[PDB]
Design the sequence.
């Protein structure tokens, strides 16, 4: 070959890069209750809106 | 060892032929006996009813050495 | 040197560093949600709890400490505890007033141990076994008021005795070592530190102010050599923090303690030596016959003359 | 480790299936796109297995791939490994005859079904045969390809005969004018009608190692097996059936007209 | 050289909701309780409304 | 415990079943909140939250969600805790006067909760036998299509003996997977109202529904009779892979030779969305033009995929009754 | 077959000596003392297979 | 400046200490002792109850319901030999009825010995409990289950003494005892779980007993333990076509268990995604246990075609564990109803693949990055895997140069600068001035 | 280290349970029936009584 550089990253190299980094828990964004109309904008001052 | 492995293969196949020959015989002859103890209300034990409640006869020629007395 | 722009910009090789090295969570800050106290494990049957509910109200529950003075809850256990006919209910109730008198530092609560529990647990080879909640409460009490009655109870928790030392938490050993260093028992420090190493307790997560108090009271010569080999059991992060806390507790921050430390400089110079060691850099009979044969020769040579 | 999985293994190999402990590791072994690419790389673009349309200036995606034998050659009877100068062009015309029949079945709802019963299948085929014998063969759909010659139906009827590529007067004469209609399954069905009209047996050197006491039970073993095998064989050749009117078996003696 | 995993053909891209197959004998029994499209009862081949009437 | 109690009460009024199990999952907690933080809900409040959740899921017949909470109560031994607070409230009043108190079996049985539970218990057992006989009869007439099937001739419930002791026998041998006395004490009150003293058939309908929901043995004995699935082998002459030679029991086809077991010939469970079942013969070849070129064409006769034994027993008895 | 495995280890003579030095480099970077309390499964004064292990 | 690697992951803490893994192993051994202690106390209580009613009631005949209550309690605790003389005299006195026989055969499957085997021996694997219950007299309990089935059908013919040639085979009691027989035979060895879809099922068909939904689910569970998935899905396909109202959770639990034994992990994903899609019947905690264990068996499975050239590839399947646990919060499945053996491996996957928004703002700090390097430098011998050692389809003749004006659009500044003296005879072709051709 | 002592504790745990269960097999009744014939046997194989129910 003498200079083969692939233009597609292999499936092994993709799976290694995905298995090394974690996921963010807020990416699932699931919601079943509803929006807190009274409290969610008036929570504690450190984590407030 | 390899010919003595064939020695137990011809000796088990004599016995495996003898067991299921009589196991078919005592089942086909009890089929014509028709022992009726249904009015007696017994414990359902018999010569046929213990033979049919026994499982499949695992053949000695299909067994390895470990199931015929040799240790692991 | 670099990568040119007309080349294919593929990933050269993948890197799996987080799956080859599984690192535990290590922060220099402590955990903000930990209890930082001795837990009692209150596990009462749910019929006596609602029955003794006006009496258990003035008692410390989970993460709650009422400010009822200790002479009222002693009088509640003096009268109402003979009425309930259950052994483990009275033992769990007595563990709460031992916890309540510890937080208010009432030294007169050791009479309750001799009144009810001494004769059936710690008197004349008693075969009965006390519950774990009762032993944890009286050892936390005797360490808080600096009572000398911990020694008869700590010897009962060994492998031939009650065998409760694998059930002790890391905060139990921190309050234990602080009281022995305050009273000044040299063999009391060694018998506990030998027990903590025999039980495989979290030696790096004991309270650092508790260790430097128990090490300050080491003055006997034979137990001082025990401390020298025991100091290697701590971690390198722990042993550099024992130097900074012991230097401040005898220096500027001496007001953090209730009673001041005593000056043990031979323990201070050894801890400062041991912390610098773990940190990176920044034939008498045969010899005496040799000398006597030489003086015998020098008198024959004349180098050691007689009286002139 | 467990006797449950040990008995499951010897049961599965007796059925002739895959053992589950063999599947304990995963093999994504040698995908087809890698094997083709290393075959092309080893053979220097794999000349010879490419068609002649690959060497043309504008090849489509079916010409860039290698030559394979598809499911078109499964039905052609006179197809050889080396056709003799006119057999490939008859095959391409026979293939175009089925593609028009595939078209005509979709026009009139005569495509096959997934749960198609064989009594429903042949009536669908018979309805497809009568509807394709009255439709003329379309020559515009018949396209020449890589290397074969453009030859009309007159020369193919001249060489192979009029029975190979028939006229509607021919198919009404066989089952019962120069024009071509789509072939049917019943007409070629008639054309082929007219033209055709002991366990654990051991070698002798193992028997040489046996003693005469062990040869006696060996010959007793093969005595009981071949009596059981021939005893089972004679019950198949007897064909004696149970007569319920007398509750006894019976055997046929004579056969009349 | 080959693989040890379960070899399976890819799932058919044919629309199984719109393809009306041959009527089975079990389908004819519950045909009075069957919900079908207007193309189902008035199909080109095997119409199911006349089976419901027969 | 009081904050999570109002969280469950908000979930009851919002009728959110997914959040009822969420508050219950937070109430149990993990190793972090219970051991490291030492912030755990006490046993009195953990009983109150799990009870009002189990009360709603049994009233709205949520079988899998009520089985999980009842599995928590048998794990934590909270089946007899409603009487424990009742004994403890009497022990609080007795220790306030100066009398000694204790906890035994005779102290628990002397309360009004257990004495009222054993008295109504014959009426609950008759309610369970009456409701099961109605559902057994409805399973038989729906198996035919409405006459009755032989499914409702002999059921799995035996007769109740004519005494209170045989009532406790009959509830323990047919509903013994759950604690039937603890369920009837839980179903006594509803929104504060004593159903056992005021609305007697409402409590009898409520207590019988809760026992039938939590019992796994009652769920297994109240099942609708299904048809018999037949095995199948592939064809000798492969036309399609979806048509198969079906296995027919001798009850379907009477007469013929006695057959062997089905797996030896090659009959297995084969079924799909487009599967069809058939009995295949071949058309008899005579002395004609067809001798060897053909594969002896597959004459087919379509058969069913199931054997409805309840309709086969009904129609044969209908031929035994309507003919005479 | 035997010559291929004999020639496979003679070219790794130089790389194993450098591998032996790299083991000494990661050895001197270890934490001093008997260890740490967080990174031990065995008690210090007891053998891990001792019958009186748990006091 | 030297460039940083963009394909190198961020250093973050995903692991536990050696003390914590020892403390998890020490705590899990205590509750295995607690379930061993809980079984033998109750086993000794029913044996003391047996010898009390045999010794002091030597001549006084007991009522039949007390002997029935003790017979099921002996069979539940794995004591089948102490219960067969009790059932033999109860059948002889004709005190047993239709529901009593199904109670005794269901008790013969021992649902108290299986609770000890689950928590202690099988490591909370629900598939391994059927494999381990078959060793404690699997063939012996199967013969008595066949004998009590013959005792039941003989008693049902007496209890039924129109539909007279179709009794008792058409009643509800015949299938209930047959469902009790298949439930007991599942706890036996491999020879008896193989006989459930073949021998017991054809015997039920030859006797003419109408099956129920629990009949097919035990046959599907019997074919699940054998590893035959082409027949197990075919039974539910029969249930999907004909009887779709009565399908409960246990048919899905057999298929999640069955593809776990056959190691077809792509199939068991599609069964779980189907159960999330339909949401009826409700997902039990046995559904979440059987699916999450199939993830962990797929994650710990090594591959052999790359032969692990860099790392383990199948560990990326643990990234689905925060997705499934988020689906359990909406399906109403409590995550506290998971076993202790599985919950340690679930939290193993959580600390490896999960981060919060508060941690994601602080995980890339250089203090935490350089602590990861020094902790790898100080003690990397304790935690390392290496240190242990146009339209183209209608195009064919392309239309070239279709007079598209490039002078209406304006791209005039395309000037290129080439090196001086390309064809000059005095200037050499090769040289270090050739490196000037790559400069932008 | 301590391989003989740790194997001897597991060996004597095997011998203690086989001794505890041998005292229960011998102190038990093993009744077998074929057709109404109660053959009562002990753990040592001795037939105690051949009865007929």
Sequence:
């Amino acid at each position: 070959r003498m200079g083969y550089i692939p233009r597609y990253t292999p499936w092994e190299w993709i799976a290694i890069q995905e298995a090394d980094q974690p996921l963010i828990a807020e990416q699932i964004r699931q919601d079943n209750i509803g929006t807190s109309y009274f409290f969610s904008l008036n929570r504690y001052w450190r984590y407030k809106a | 060892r390899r010919v003595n492995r064939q020695k137990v293969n011809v000796a088990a196949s004599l016995l495996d032929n003898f067991v299921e020959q009589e196991w078919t015989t005592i089942l086909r002859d009890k089929h014509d006996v028709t022992d009726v103890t249904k009015t007696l209300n017994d414990t359902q034990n018999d010569k046929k009813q213990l033979a049919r409640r026994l499982g499949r006869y695992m053949l000695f020629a299909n067994r390895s050495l470990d199931d015929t007395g040799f240790p692991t | 040197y670099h990568w040119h722009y007309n080349l294919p910009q593929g990933m050269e090789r993948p890197h799996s560093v987080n799956r080859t090295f599984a690192a535990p969570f290590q922060s220099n800050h402590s955990l903000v949600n930990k209890y930082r106290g001795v837990w009692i494990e209150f596990d009462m049957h749910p019929a006596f709890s609602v029955a003794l509910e006006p009496q258990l109200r003035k008692l410390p529950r989970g993460r709650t400490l009422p400010k009822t003075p200790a002479e009222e809850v002693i009088a509640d256990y003096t009268a109402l505890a003979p009425l309930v006919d259950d052994e483990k209910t009275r033992d769990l109730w007595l563990a709460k007033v031992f916890q309540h008198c510890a937080f208010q530092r009432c030294g007169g609560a050791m009479e309750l141990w001799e009144r009810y529990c001494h004769q059936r647990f710690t008197a004349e080879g008693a075969t009965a076994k006390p519950p774990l909640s009762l032993v944890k409460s009286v050892l936390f009490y005797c360490n808080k008021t600096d009572n000398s009655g911990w020694r008869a109870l700590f010897d009962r928790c060994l492998k031939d005795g009650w065998n409760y030392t694998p059930l002790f938490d890391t905060a139990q050993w921190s309050f234990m070592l602080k009281s022995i260093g305050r009273m000044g028992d040299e063999d009391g420090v060694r018998a506990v530190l030998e027990e903590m190493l025999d039980v495989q307790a979290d030696l790096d997560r004991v309270e650092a102010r508790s260790v430097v108090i128990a090490l300050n009271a080491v003055t006997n010569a034979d137990v001082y050599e025990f401390v020298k080999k025991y100091l290697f059991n701590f971690g390198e992060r722990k042993v550099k923090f024992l130097r900074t806390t012991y230097s401040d507790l005898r220096g500027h921050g001496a007001g953090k303690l209730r009673i001041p430390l005593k000056e043990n400089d031979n323990m201070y110079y050894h801890v400062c030596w041991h912390s610098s060691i773990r940190s990176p850099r920044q034939p008498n009979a045969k010899i005496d016959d040799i000398v006597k044969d030489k003086i015998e020769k020098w008198k024959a040579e004349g180098l050691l003359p007689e009286d002139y | 480790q467990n006797k449950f999985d040990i008995m499951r293994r010897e049961d599965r190999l007796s059925k002739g299936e895959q053992d589950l402990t063999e599947r304990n590791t995963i093999h994504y072994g040698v995908p087809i796109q890698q094997i083709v690419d290393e075959f092309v790389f080893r053979h220097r673009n794999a000349r010879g297995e490419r068609p002649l349309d690959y060497f043309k200036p504008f090849p489509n995606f079916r010409a860039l791939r290698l030559n394979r034998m598809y499911r078109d050659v499964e039905g052609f009877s006179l197809m050889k490994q080396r056709p003799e100068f006119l057999e490939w062009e008859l095959f391409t015309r026979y293939r175009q005859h089925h593609q028009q029949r595939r078209r005509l079945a979709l026009l009139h709802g005569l495509e096959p079904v997934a749960n198609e019963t064989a009594q429903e299948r042949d009536t669908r085929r018979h309805r497809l045969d009568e509807i394709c014998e009255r439709t003329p063969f379309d020559e515009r759909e018949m396209r020449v390809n890589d290397d074969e010659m453009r030859v009309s139906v007159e020369t193919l009827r001249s060489w192979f005969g009029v029975y190979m590529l028939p006229s509607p007067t021919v198919v009404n004469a066989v089952l019962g004018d120069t024009r071509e209609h789509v072939l049917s399954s019943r007409y070629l069905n008639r054309l082929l009608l007219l033209e055709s009209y002991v366990p654990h047996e051991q070698p002798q050197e193992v028997l040489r190692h046996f003693s005469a006491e062990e040869r006696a039970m060996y010959e007793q073993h093969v005595k009981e097996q071949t009596s059981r095998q021939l005893g089972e064989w004679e019950r198949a050749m007897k064909r004696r059936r149970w007569l319920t009117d007398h509750q006894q078996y019976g055997h046929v003696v004579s056969h009349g007209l | 050289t080959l693989h040890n995993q379960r070899s399976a053909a890819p799932e058919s891209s044919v629309s199984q909701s719109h393809t009306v197959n041959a009527p089975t004998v079990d389908e004819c029994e519950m045909l009075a309780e069957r919900w079908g499209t207007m193309n189902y009862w008035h199909n080109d081949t095997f119409p199911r409304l006349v089976v419901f009437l027969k | 415990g009081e904050v999570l109690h109002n969280l469950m009460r908000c979930a009851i009024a919002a009728r959110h079943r997914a959040r009822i199990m969420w508050v219950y999952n937070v109430m149990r907690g993990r190793f972090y909140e219970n051991v490291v933080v030492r912030a755990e809900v006490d046993l009195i409040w953990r009983y109150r939250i799990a009870m009002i959740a189990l009360e709603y899921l049994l009233d709205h017949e949520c079988a899998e969600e009520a089985a999980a909470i009842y599995s928590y109560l048998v794990e934590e031994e909270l089946l007899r805790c409603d009487v424990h607070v009742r004994v403890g409230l009497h022990m609080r009043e007795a220790i306030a006067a100066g009398k000694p108190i204790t906890l035994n079996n005779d102290v628990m049985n002397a309360t009004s909760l257990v004495r009222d539970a054993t008295a109504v218990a014959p009426e609950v057992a008759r309610e369970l036998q009456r409701r099961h006989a109605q559902t057994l009869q409805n399973n038989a007439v729906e198996a035919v299509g409405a006459g009755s099937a032989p499914w409702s001739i002999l059921g799995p419930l035996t007769a109740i003996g004519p005494t209170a002791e045989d009532t406790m026998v009959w509830l323990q041998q047919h509903y013994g997977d759950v604690d039937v006395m603890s369920i009837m004490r839980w179903a006594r009150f509803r929104k504060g109202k004593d159903l056992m003293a005021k609305d007697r058939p409402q409590y009898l309908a409520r207590a019988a529904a809760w026992i039938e929901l939590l019992s796994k043995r009652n769920r297994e004995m109240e099942e609708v009779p299904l048809t018999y699935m037949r095995k199948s082998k592939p064809l000798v002459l492969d036309t399609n892979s979806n048509v198969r030679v079906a296995w027919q029991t001798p009850l379907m086809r009477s007469g013929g030779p006695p057959r062997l077991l089905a797996r030896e010939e090659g009959y297995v469970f084969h079924h799909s969305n487009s599967s069809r079942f058939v009995e295949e013969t071949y058309r008899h070849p005579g002395e004609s033009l067809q001798s060897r070129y053909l594969a002896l064409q597959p004459l087919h006769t379509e058969v069913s995929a199931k054997e409805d034994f309840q309709r086969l027993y009904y129609q044969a008895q209908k031929h035994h009754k309507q003919q005479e | 077959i035997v010559l291929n495995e004999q020639l496979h280890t003679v070219k790794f003579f130089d790389l194993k000596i450098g591998d032996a030095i790299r083991d000494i480099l990661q050895l001197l970077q270890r934490e001093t003392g008997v260890g740490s309390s967080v990174n031990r499964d065995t008690p210090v004064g007891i053998s891990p297979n001792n019958p009186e292990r748990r006091v | 400046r030297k460039p940083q690697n963009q394909w190198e992951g961020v250093y973050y803490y995903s692991g536990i200490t050696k003390r914590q893994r020892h403390l998890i192993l020490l705590h899990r051994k205590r509750e295995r002792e607690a379930h061993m202690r809980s079984f033998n106390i109750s086993r000794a209580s029913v044996l003391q109850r047996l010898e009390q009613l045999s010794g002091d009631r030597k001549q006084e005949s007991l009522p039949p319901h007390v002997r029935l209550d003790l017979a099921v309690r002996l069979a539940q605790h794995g004591l089948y030999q102490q219960a067969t003389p009790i059932v033999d005299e109860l059948h002889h006195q004709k005190a047993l009825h239709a529901g009593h026989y199904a109670l005794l055969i269901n008790a013969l499957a021992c649902p108290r010995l299986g609770q000890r085997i689950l928590h202690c021996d099988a490591q909370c694997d629900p598939a391994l409990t059927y494999k381990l219950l078959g060793d404690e007299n699997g063939e012996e309990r199967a013969q008595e289950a066949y004998r009590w089935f013959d005792l039941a059908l003989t008693s049902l013919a007496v209890d039924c003494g129109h539909f007279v040639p179709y009794l008792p085979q058409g009643t509800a009691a015949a299938s209930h005892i047959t469902n009790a027989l298949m439930r007991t035979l599942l706890t036996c060895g491999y020879t008896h779980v193989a006989a459930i879809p073949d021998s017991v099922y054809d015997r039920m068909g030859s006797m003419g007993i109408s099956p129920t939904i629990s009949t097919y689910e035990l046959v599907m569970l019997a074919l699940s333990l054998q590893g035959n998935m082409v027949e197990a899905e075919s039974i539910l396909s029969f249930l999907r076509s004909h009887h779709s109202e009565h399908i409960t959770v246990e048919s899905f639990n057999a298929l999640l268990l069955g593809h776990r034994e056959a190691r077809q992990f792509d199939c068991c994903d599609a069964i779980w995604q189907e159960l999330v899609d339909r949401r009826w019947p409700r997902a039990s905690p046995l559904t979440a246990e059987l699916y999450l264990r199939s993830i962990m068996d797929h994650a710990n499975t090594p591959t052999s075609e790359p032969l692990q050239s860099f790392a383990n590839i199948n560990v990326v399947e643990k990234k689905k564990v925060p997705l499934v646990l988020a689906q359990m919060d909406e399906l109403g499945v409590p995550r506290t109803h998971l076993s202790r053996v599985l919950m340690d491996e679930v939290e193993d996957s959580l600390r490896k693949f999960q981060t919060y928004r508060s941690r994601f703002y602080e995980w890339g700090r250089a203090v935490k990055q350089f602590d990861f390097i020094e902790f790898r430098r100080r003690n990397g011998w304790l935690y390392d895997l290496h240190l242990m050692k146009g339209d183209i389809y209608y195009d064919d003749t392309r239309g070239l140069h279709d007079r598209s004006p490039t002078w209406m659009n304006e791209v005039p500044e395309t000037r290129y600068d080439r090196l001086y003296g390309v064809n000059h005879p005095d200037i050499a072709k090769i040289g270090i001035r050739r490196h000037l051709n790559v400069e932008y | 280290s301590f391989r003989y002592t740790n194997n001897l504790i597991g060996a004597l745990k095997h011998r203690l349970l086989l001794e505890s269960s041998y005292r229960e097999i011998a102190s038990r009744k093993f009744i077998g029936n074929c057709r109404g014939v109660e053959v009562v046997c002990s753990g040592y194989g001795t037939v105690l009584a051949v009865q007929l129910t």
About this structure: The two ends of chain E are 59 Å apart (CA to CA). Residues 3 and 9 of chain E are 15 Å apart (CA to CA). The first helix of chain E runs from residue 25 to 29. Chains E and B do not touch (no CB pair under 8 Å).
